[PDB]
Amino acid sequence: LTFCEIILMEMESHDAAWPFLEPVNPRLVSGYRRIIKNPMDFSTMRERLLRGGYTSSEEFAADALLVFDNCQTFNEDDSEVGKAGHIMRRFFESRWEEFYQ
Ligand SMILES: CN(C)CCn1c(=O)oc2ccc(NC(=O)c3ccc(=O)n(C)c3)cc21
């Protein structure tokens, strides 16, 4: 899972990562809690990873993909947040394939 941490750090430093660094505060984003039932973000992933809460790379990847699937459900593809989610998903998938094929 050290390679999960490497990928997480690269995601956290990406130019398109800004929507995903911290949990969405649903008080500030109308409809978020109604539409997205299983929120996820990179800081929540980091807290779990550091504490040993992922028992396989698959569990970590499922949380990453949940970030991107939530983003695609909630936001238009041509919105700033939606565009960022598509970039981040492809970045994740590309880096993932280097360590986990
Ligand atoms: C103007 N506008 C494009 C940016 C505003 N803006 C900012 O200046 O700093 C931010 C920091 C975080 C957020 N996040 C969200 O808007 C959001 C909305 C739906 C969603 O699914 N996610 C994952 C994130 C927005 C901002």
- What's phi and psi for 54, nearest 5 deg? -100, 130
Cα–Cα distance for residue pair 86/92, rounded to 1 Å: 10
> Can you read off the two tokens belonging to residue 93?
């998938």
Method: X-ray
* Cα dihedral value 17, 96, 52, 44, nearest 10: 20
| Resolution expressed in Å | 1.1
CATH of the domain at 59: 1.20.920.10
Q: Which domain holds residue 72?
A: 1-101
**Ligand 1 centroid from CA 11, angstroms:** 17
**Ligand 1 centroid from CA 101, angstroms:** 32
Distance from CA of residue 66 to its chain's centroid?
A: 6
Nearest Cα to Cα of residue 96 among 53, 73, 71, 63: 63
Cα–Cα distance for residue pair 38/51, rounded to 1 Å: 20
The end-to-end CA distance of the chain, in Å, is 15
Ligand 1, atom nearest to 41 Cα: 23
Cα–Cα distance for residue pair 15/44, rounded to 1 Å: 19
C-beta atoms surrounding 88 within 10 Å? 22
Q: Please count the structural domains in the chain.
A: 1
Query: To test ligand 1's pocket by mutation, which of 12, 14, 24, 27 has the most ligand atoms within 8 angstroms of CB?
Result: 24
Closest residue CA from atom 2 of ligand 1: 80
Closest residue CA from atom 22 of ligand 1: 19
